[PDB]
Amino acid sequence: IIRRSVANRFLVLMGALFLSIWGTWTIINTPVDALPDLS
Amino acid sequence: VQLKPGTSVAFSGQFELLERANHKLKLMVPMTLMIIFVLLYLAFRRVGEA
């Protein structure tokens, strides 16, 4: 599980980069609020 | 033709749907290219051939 992932590390790095881009987008595009709806 | 304050002019009908579909198709190409490149690296394991 660890050895089989370090072997093909190029795909892992590409996936990590894509995840970083997607997460940055989702973060800059997330709504905001003060407190969750307790009503 | 000169406009008047308080009135607007908007084209509707097939043109609105055409513009919507055009924007969607314009922003849809990157996803296709990325999927193709990913599945190509999955098969050749090299960026060069991909």
From Swiss-Prot, chain A:
Subcellular location(s) of the protein: Cell inner membrane
Membrane-spanning parts: 10-30
Superkingdom of origin organism: Bacteria
Induction data: Transcriptionally regulated by CusR in response to copper and silver ions.
Additional record remark: The cus system plays an important role in copper tolerance under anaerobic growth and, under extreme copper stress, in aerobic growth.
Stated family: Belongs to the resistance-nodulation-cell division (RND) (TC 2.A.6) family.
Quaternary assembly: The cus efflux system is composed of CusA, CusB, CusC and CusF.
Task of the protein: Part of a cation efflux system that mediates resistance to copper and silver.
UniProt name for this protein: Cation efflux system protein CusA
Organism: Escherichia coli (strain K12)
Lineage summary: Bacteria, Pseudomonadati, Pseudomonadota, Gammaproteobacteria, Enterobacterales
UniProt gene name: cusA
